[PDB]
Every structure is written in C-alpha cells, then in structure tokens.
Design a protein around this ligand. Structure first.
Ligand code: PEA
Ligand code: PEA
Lengths: 110, 360, 120, 360
C-alpha cells in the first residue's frame, strides 16, 4: 500500500518512492543523503478524515532509483510559490545534488 | 573506405528541431536530440549531463546548454556551467562557470533564456533562494545575480526591447528588469497585481507576443501583461470557457502548455475535461485555439496526450510533445492540421524548440 | 551492394545488412552519420575489431573494420548484436564485447559502424 | 512528527543479498549495481558505477569493489580509471584507488574483475588495446603490479586452492598461471601446454570453477579442463556435451557468463540452444543442461527462460540465471533445478549477477 502512488501521503510526489528503493517512507536508502529542504504538501487522510502537512524530502547523492515513479500534484503550485512546487530537484542544496528518490514525511495536522 | 569525423549536420538549419531529453530514469545522461521536422530524421545530439537545459542562440549559430557536473558525478566538487556549442558541427566550444545554484528542474522555457539582442543569457537560480543569473556570452562571463527577483520565478524576455525581461513574483505581479550594456541591472519596475496566487494561480508559460504576453490559469482564465509602454499594464481575467465547457470542467494542463501565433493573435492551449485539484499537469485531451482579440475559441482538435508545445512564427507551425513523440502541425489557418508524428524522439522530454529562422 | 550511400536507408539501417555481420552497438547511420562518417561531434576510433562478411549480392567475402565513433553519449538507435566469426578476447581484434573507443581521447561510446576494407 | 534520516544499513542479512550489475547500455554513463534480496525479490539498494562499471564483493563479505571510468566533463576532459571500495552494509563510498588509464571497458564477464582467494589483491584486466593484468593491493589502496607477461591473453580465473594465484587464457590456446607474492608483485609464473585450438574449437572464457580445476565449454559444444591441483596446470579435452540426437539438432552453448559448477556434486550447468551455427554463440538459452563432469554425460535438461548469464552459490545450493532484465532463482540441491521465483525488472541491461559471499 505504501509503495503505490495512490497512498494518501504521496499526494504531491514527483519522483521515485524511497520505500521502493531500499529505504522507507522516512528513511533514505543506504548511502543516500536526506535533503535539508523540501517542497510541502497538504494531503487528506481517508481514514481519519483529517488533512496533514507532508514534507517531501529527497534522498540525494546516488543516481536515479528508477522504481515506483509517481507524479501526483494535489495542491502543487508553480515556482513563484516555491516550497509548494515539485518540478524542481529538492536535492539542489545538498553536497551532491544527484536525485535518488523522494520521501513523504508527516509533519503534522495542517 | 575510411571513417571520418568533422562533419556538419546533414539537413539545413531551417529543418532542425531540438528535443530536450531529460532521460529522467537516468538523469545524469540527459541530452538534446536534433531532428529534422520535415521527415523525422535523427540528425545528431548534444550531451548535457545531469538535467540539462538548452536553447539556441537568437542568431542561429550556436547551441547553449546549462548543466551540472561533479568531479565524480555522485560525489566531489560541483561545477554548474553554460556551454556554447557550434550548431552545425554539434561540437563543444566554451564553458562559462556559474555559481553552484543554477536551477535543477523540469525543462520549462523560462528557466533558461536570452535577451532579445542575444548578448546575454538569462537563467533561473535557486539555492533555494531565487535569483536570476546573467551571463555575457561574448565575454564568457557570469555578470551577477539579480537578487531583486528573490521570491519570483522564470524569465520572460521582452521581444520589443534589446535587454529587458520580466519574471513572475509571489505577490502575483511582474518584475521587469532592464539591463545595461554590461549585463548589470540598469533599472527595474514592478507591475500591479495581475493574478491572485491563492485563488487563480497561472501557469508560468507565456503566450508571448512582440509587446505583450498572455498567461492561462489553473481554472481556465486568461491574464495579460502589456509592455508596449513605459510600465507593464496588466489585465484579466477572461475565461477560456463557455457554459458547456464549464459544465464538463474543462481546464488547462501541461508544462510548456501554450503558444501564440503573433500574426493572427491565435493562442494555443492544452486542455482536458473533469478538471479538479491536482490535474494541472494532465496530458491534453484537446488543443484549443483562441482568438485573443475576440476572446472566442476558433478551433478544438484532439490533444494526442501532449504536454508541451512550441510555435514557429516564420513557417506557421506548431510542435507538440507527449514525453516521447513530437507532432508537427500546420497552423497557417485557424484549425491546426496534423502533418506527421515523430515517434521515439525522446524517452522523457517536456521541451521541444525550433532552430531559429530570422526573428530580427 | 558495396555503396551504402546509394542504397535504401532502411536497408543499410538494418542489422541484417550484409556488412554489419559482427556489429555490437548502435549503427552510426541511424545516429546522424552514415556508414563511413561519424555523426557530427563524435570522433572515429583509431582501432577497431575486424572480420569478414559475405556479400550475398556479389557472392564475395569482404574484410570489414568495425570502428566506433566516440566522445558522445550513447546514440540509442538501431542497436545490433551480430556475431558472425566473432571470437573472445584471446583473439582480441576479432572481439566485439569491448569498447573500441577505449583508446580515444574520450572513450564514451556513441555508435559503431562497418567500414569496407577490401576483399577478404 | 517524523524526521527523515540517513546513515542506514541494508535491511536484509548479507546472506540474502545478490548484486545485479546493470550496464544500462542505453545510457552507459549511468551504469549501477542493484542489490536485491533473492529470497523475496525486494530491492535493497544500489551503488552508482558511472561509465561501464564492473563490480565484485570482497571474499570476506565486508566491502563492495567497483571499477569504472570518469572524465572531468564526462564526454571531455581528463580520464580517471579507478577502483572504488564501498562498505557492503552502508553502501557508502570509502576509498578511490587510481588505475592507469587502460582498465578494460567491456561487457561484464566475471573474469575481467576478480580477486585473489585470500582477498588481499584485486586482479583486473587492462586493454590499451595491448592487454595486461593489473594488481591492486586492497589494504594499501594502491595499484602495485602490471603483469605484462599476460600480453595476448584475456581474463582472470582465480585458483581457489591457493592464496594469490590465478590463470589467464592466452592466444596460443594455453593458460598462463601467475602466482603473486605477499607484496602483490609476480612471485612466479608458468605456462601450460595447449589446451584448445583457438581457430578450430574456440572456448568461451567463462570457467566452471572447482576448488582445484576449471572446465570450459566451446563454441561447438566440447569441454576442456585445466587441473591445477599441482604447480603445473594439466590440461585435457575435448569431450562433447552432445550425444547423437543432440548433434542432429545442432545444439551448442550460447551466452555470456554461461556456465557454472556445483562443486559438491561435480554438476556443470550450461546454457544451450538448438540450430547452432556461426554467429549464435551469444544466443539466449533454449535450455539449461546439467552435466555430470565425472561421467561426462548429461543428467538433466530444463527450460532456459532465454537466459544469458548465471552464477552459483555453493553453500545454499542455488543457481541464478539472468536474461538481461530478469533474475531467476533456482534450487540446485538435487540434479534437476527447481525454479523458486523470478525477480522481474532487476535491471535494464545486465549480463552479470553475483551472490554476496558467505564462505569467508
Ligand atoms: N522531488 C522532485 C524530483 C526531481 C528531480 C529532478 C528534477 C525534477 C524533479
Ligand atoms: N562496438 C562497441 C561495443 C561496446 C561498446 C561499449 C561497451 C561494450 C561494447
């Protein structure tokens, strides 16, 4: 269920799900580095009916994972609202900017 | 027989198009594929490393790329660069060093542009703080950051001025920057608010005329910025949609999703039905053709799941691109006519561009 | 039969074209070059694997030199993996599982071809 | 709240891990090793290997070694050929070892990148295009020897019954044995008598390797052997894999890493296809044949699933096969292999899969 693009948390993921790449939803695959910056989504939880803020951190410094590619765009906005925008590499500020996979980190209720 | 190199592209410049293949699955080996649009022939390519961007010089002599290298790819020192390549030989000529913050992201036109006089390359930076970088092509130098554009995004050149451009800002207005002959900011101005960022966000892709630009919104509205005079005058919204359109929830979607045929004033836009939150990048069910003067739709044709387009003013053509295949349309009349499809032009491209012909 | 530039492109761009009988890689004639010219901005290899191919049109055997073009990333088009008379690396210059761009100024492999040397 | 963390180790035990070397030939500058759990098909992680990487795991199971080529600007600039040492559990880079710029660039046969039985030295094939064998001292992180005695030979076959000995196949159809000293420099060497006719019955380079002997199959379905139970290698053959019925349908071997030996039983595994003729030596397997090397007779045959390469795990009695993209897991504890599972989409273009070592 977590490895599907329809999983409720993944509502603004543009990239490969880290949970398909040897990591988990909140852990980078071995040898890839978390981004200190991310785009943010607001996603609806179909179980408790509540909306939650999700931080879409990338894992960086390894070449593309290639598995579980998602391109979901719920509440995504262009680069003039930069931290809601997912057509940029949120690995951009890492020591190595190569994009590996994307995580879906639960921050809290909206 | 003897195998030789040093050869030029086999078809003339006026036949050429540039398909920017991100190769997202292997994004470190992105490249530009050069095709002949008249017959679908593959003509050559330019390698562009990690997430390349590409444009052709306004004078048609050179290809400009923007990319990122590291000493050992996934580790080691970062080098962000503009490269200058010869258009006919598809050979590397010059590297121009950038600060290590050039935009890494999908290939929207407005991230990597040039002034109308072709003297400066104008590019988007993100560290993730945003600024606009200016490169002096002749000198082969990075001039400096336009930090006045913090909080804004993308570059819309003004085709009626030699070295002016606009950017879309978080306040829903446009910032205009005018460069001096050295590439530094000579003056700037901010428009009034054009669109509501919260209630009617626009797509960044302009439908660009000589002295104005049109933009479409997530909800099918149209806005404009007229820069014929001293200051940018903004207007909108008007709707792309009639009652029947609204009833089926038709909205735009795509990436480089609009174009303008300047001579006629026709605007081309990718559209799909059953619009709702999250559908703004859906492939085109249809292409709509709007008369921007009368504000009416004058044609609608099948979208072929296209996501990006580009217009050639000089030959009255429109190209569309679905990620892998390029469709060639004759747009000399209100209803576009499909000429051919070039299959397998890319593995993952959201941008195609013509080789410039004329344009002075 | 001996002049690919005079033949139908669809014939020369095929892996069953008679002279492509030990090609491992992307045919340069599909990559913006021709059978005997590197695509623009790619460099011929000074070394190659070699071998003979039979020409069914004139009934004769010909020596072929399988040069690569180098210094650009993979062309990706018209991939062939034909192995007529190909031998392992202990007969090194008949071997096609190595990159014959290996000694170029840039060894990145772009495309391959089949250069006619003469009668076998 | 949640926090994204790094620094994690591979989630499955070493004993579950296999290494699929994905050349990604379509984009060969972004080759990589994919790490999988063979017990359930789960993807565990990966190691980037730039242009045409090769890979092996240290005999002690603690480290992954890669061999690759970089350039300063990928398609231009200075070349660096390297061996890298990576941690096996963290899949992190630890050390680069500089090589002379002549490491073999080619498809991933096992014998191009090997190590001594004691694990102290990496033994790699060079081609400039003149051939030699390079020796890397793992502890020192240095290239320490260049075995020019091996000119005109190809590939490395370690001797499992000696600490720092290996053989290579030479253009005379014999074998050159190299015994390294504890410094990694050649301590002695010997040359066998001719084993096979290079012209009349070429062998595949892939050994079916026992503790004290190696078997090789030929283009025409014969088997040759090199016995290294003593200091001088004794060579023999051919015997045919084929009976009269087999000959009537022109069965021959085909593939890349196409053979394997189960040491406890003496069973040799070979990919075979019918209708063999000149040019079919790399055809996918129609069948896998299981040969009793003692009796020199086939004992079983099963569907080949279009496989090209294989590897054997002695201690768990497993065989993996690989068709370029998918990995099949077989139990070979009994003479008939039993298919346990297929891992689909393990690679885009792989001709090599290897188990994590458990022997030490
Ligand atoms: N989370 C976004 C992944 C991405 C990487 C590179 C470019 C665009 C997007
Ligand atoms: N003709 C070249 C074949 C080849 C290229 C690169 C790598 C392996 C093989």
């Amino acid at each position: 269920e977590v490895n599907s693009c329809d999983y409720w948390r993944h509502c603004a993921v543009d990239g490969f799900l880290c949970s398909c790449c040897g990591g988990t939803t909140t852990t980078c695959p071995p040898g890839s580095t978390p981004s200190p910056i991310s785009w943010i989504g607001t996603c609806h939880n179909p179980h408790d009916g509540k909306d939650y803020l999700i931080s879409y951190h990338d894992c960086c410094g390894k070449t593309a994972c290639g598995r579980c590619q998602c391109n979901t765009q719920t509440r995504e906005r262009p680069g003039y609202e930069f931290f809601l925008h997912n057509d940029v590499n949120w690995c951009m500020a890492n020591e190595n900017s190569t994009f590996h996979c994307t995580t879906s980190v639960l921050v809290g209720l909206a | 027989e003897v195998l030789t190199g040093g050869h030029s592209v086999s078809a003339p410049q006026e036949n050429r198009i540039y398909v920017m293949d991100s190769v997202f699955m292997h994004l470190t080996e992105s490249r530009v594929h050069v095709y002949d649009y008249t017959n679908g022939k593959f003509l050559g390519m330019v390698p562009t490393a990690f997430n390349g961007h590409v444009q052709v010089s306004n004078d048609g002599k050179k290809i400009y790329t923007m990319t990122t290298y590291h000493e050992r790819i996934t580790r080691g020192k970062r080098s962000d660069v503009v490269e200058v390549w010869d258009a006919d030989k598809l050979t590397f000529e010059k590297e121009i060093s950038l600060p290590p913050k050039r935009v890494q992201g999908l290939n929207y036109d407005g991230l990597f542009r040039q002034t109308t006089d072709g003297k400066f390359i104008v590019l988007q930076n993100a560290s993730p703080a945003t600024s606009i970088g200016i490169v002096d092509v002749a000198k082969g130098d990075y001039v400096e950051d336009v930090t006045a554009a913090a909080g804004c995004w993308s570059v819309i050149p003004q085709p009626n001025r030699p070295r002016s451009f606009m950017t879309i800002c978080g306040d829903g207005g446009l910032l205009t920057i005018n460069l001096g002959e050295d590439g530094k900011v000579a003056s700037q101005s901010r428009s009034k608010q054009m669109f509501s960022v919260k209630d009617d966000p626009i797509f960044i892709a302009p439908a660009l005329d000589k002295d104005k630009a049109h933009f479409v919104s997530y909800y099918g509205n149209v806005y404009s910025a007229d820069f014929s005079g001293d200051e940018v005058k903004v207007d909108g919204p008007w709707s792309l949609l009639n009652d029947e359109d609204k009833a089926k929830n038709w909205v735009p979607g795509g990436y480089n999703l609009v174009g303008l045929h300047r001579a006629s004033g026709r605007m081309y836009v990718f559209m799909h039905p059953d619009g709702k939150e999250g559908t703004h990048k859906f492939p085109a069910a249809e292409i709509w053709v709007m008369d921007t003067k009368t504000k009416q739709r004058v044609a609608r044709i099948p979208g072929r799941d296209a996501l990006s387009m580009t217009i050639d003013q000089q030959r009255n053509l429109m190209l569309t691109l679905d990620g892998g295949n390029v469709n060639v349309y004759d747009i000399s009349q209100p209803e576009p006519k499909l000429l051919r499809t070039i299959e397998g032009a890319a593995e993952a491209s959201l941008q195609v561009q013509f080789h410039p012909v004329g344009g002075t």
